């Protein structure tokens, strides 16, 4: 099926924030069995590796925001492959990685499917512009150079001049939001974004957040959905192997629930499984309970359901 | 008063499942305090014992189930006993022990009030017949016993010639369900069983799946109601020491509100308190704390509310 | 703005109960940095200092009740500072402390605004007379002295002769009730008494019980909110160090959208952050959760928002 055709790419690549250890993402993911639970469960899956994220000396910062070339490259990179694997009749499954490469991950996608509606399920808005931002770490600002609206409030960055906005403000539902710098609540509030914070999370229940967040993108017509997933977007008592954790968040039934109800709207295109570092548990156990989370939240996207799962085959007989 | 009224049963058995230790529940709930918290909360309690389970040694699979003298025997000694407490004009509490008892429980219970209703709490559908089931252990096969829909579907197993099913698929609603095999999905889906997976839990909210749940059980007349209450039902946060346990869980709270729900129709009949196995823990804790919810969960059962209770008296003088 | 107007009152009192440490609650409170948070998130805030309470020797219990002239002298002193601060056209925020002193901060702020509605966020209803105690705690004791409709029913109790009492049954509202007495349970029902037990919001969820509560006590017309938040309403997995704590409490996100809710109707006139008990922590990061739990629900409400906060500029120039 359609729903259950995969292409899986590895993206270990670290530089788009300053914690060591999220370029091992993939390698733990893979570990952790996700390609065989996956065809356990009906899946056609096609493995396209890990890319290969060449190192980049003398890369200066542009302004405050780091390691520039590096980050638009691996983007730039990532884009092609995800074009590719959108090309072959398969839905992308990025495992990250910092969520910069989500620049990539949606450019590529929308290449092939511009009409894409995205989920972006974070702690997080990563809204921040090269000028917003007191950071300087890009994986707070994918979301900027992918939207039409701040065109001309994006300045040149020295590898970036490859991106085009592929996304209007209309066309993303955030989820699980708790962490918005002001310069980004500016931006959420001024371009009209829909999104659902802990907050409204909260008010309706996930169940009408889900109603409310498939309504408002697949009303007008059934078109292409990008689910752009942060582990931080749960609560660190699930994920606490990841960079930036913030208490508060969604629960593991939450995550499951929101990854289900998507499945069963049978439009997912596109799928990324960010910032998972596993050097960043306090115990072995947390790094173990955050894959497995992470494991457990992909499989629920191509079918894994907690009231079961059957063959078209009659049991009783 | 009928709904505080009460017979206990202690069911030590452990022939069902592989782990040992379930054997000790009723020990270990009765050390806890319970049959003195119930007469604290002006219940009227009498206490049958525990039901001795002599030894069936001899007792070979019927092809890959285990143990099914010993378990088929167990469940009808404690039949006969439920039977009897039903007789008395009792609730029967029935203490765990692992879940296969409930073949017993219901079916003796089923004896004096054929009309019952069943409302089962737990991870698990327990509905494998002898012939779908992987694992061959009876605990995670009753429910296909005592369903009518399912008479012809049930091999002749040693020890089960007395069963004879006593419930409708339309008498039987599923709370708490994460952990369900394709064999007792099918099973599921095909009979029409009203169940709220993990899934409806966070679409509808607890409030509306025990509105739903007594409406579809009651609304057409009133009848006795069966609970059988699986500990792994509840997320291990709060029941960490039984067999099977699996993330995801119906909370402490959710917990609370289905027992204080159902003890306000007035119409429960009959209890099963299941699964507890204090040598499962990480920690002598991780015992305490699942015994201490367990009790707290039976307590809700026979009237203790949050909000409070009192006797009909001027406390004001 | 008057929504952001603060008047600080440190309240280290801790006779209205037996456990020592609840003293400590507002140097913690400011320790963890309070006041400097307050003022990031652009509030007007005055120190009135931390009250002195003169130790009172030969303190004869009153029947069973503890320390009645050192509980009646604190709460005697703070209903002068609380007042003293609303006449200065500032929100009083009393850092305690036991809960025995809402005698103290309701009395004075009712003082200036007679038509005050108050919002009782606790485990507990408080509202046990002196001679339902069974404990013979204050703390567990403040509301009896309040309500306008148990007058008669409270004795002369020395150190109490100033209590005037001020508030009406109907101008109350409770949230997180787990832990109601007899007595108390019956006054709830005599009085007709609005709460939301977790019974409640398990029932309807915490959107359904804001929009209630909210609508309860401003429905008719806008009137002075006044919130008494006890730590202990939330649960002990957020916040253990504190004097009474009972489990399956209000979640971190549930505390949040209470005071997020209480924010946005521009309306808090008076707020307590009650019970923190720095001396109860099994380690020393029970301490910081509960203080750091203690102080977002407080920067919630002087307008710290989950989906983010912005200054009146334009960030995108
Ligand atoms: O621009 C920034 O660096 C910050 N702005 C809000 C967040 N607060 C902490 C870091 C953060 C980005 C999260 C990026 B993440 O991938 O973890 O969602
Ligand atoms: O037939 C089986 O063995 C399995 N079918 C689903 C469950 N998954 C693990 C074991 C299990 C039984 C749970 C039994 B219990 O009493 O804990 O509900
Ligand atoms: O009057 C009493 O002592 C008791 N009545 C119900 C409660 N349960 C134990 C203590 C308690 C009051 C808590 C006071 B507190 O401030 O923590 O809400
Ligand atoms: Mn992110
Ligand atoms: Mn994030
Ligand atoms: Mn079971
Ligand atoms: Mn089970
Ligand atoms: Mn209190
Ligand atoms: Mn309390």
Redesign the interface.
Known sequence: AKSRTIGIIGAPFSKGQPRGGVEEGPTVLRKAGLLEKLKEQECDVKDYGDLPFADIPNDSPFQIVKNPRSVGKASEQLAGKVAEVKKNGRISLVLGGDHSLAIGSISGHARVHPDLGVIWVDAH?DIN?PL?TTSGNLHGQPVSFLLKELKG?IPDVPGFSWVTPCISAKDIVYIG??D???????????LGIK?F???????????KV?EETLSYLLGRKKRPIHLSFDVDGLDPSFTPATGTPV??GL????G??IT?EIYKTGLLSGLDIMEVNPSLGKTPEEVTRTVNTAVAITLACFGL???????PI???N
Request: aromatic share 10%.
């Open positions: 808005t512009t917003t409030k939001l708790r918005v710098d002001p310069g980004e609540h500016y931006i959420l509030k001024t999104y914070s802990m907050t409204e999370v909260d008010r309706l229940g996930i169940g889900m208490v508060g629960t593991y039934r939450e499951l629930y289900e359901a907690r009231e079961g799962n059957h063959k009659d049991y009783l």
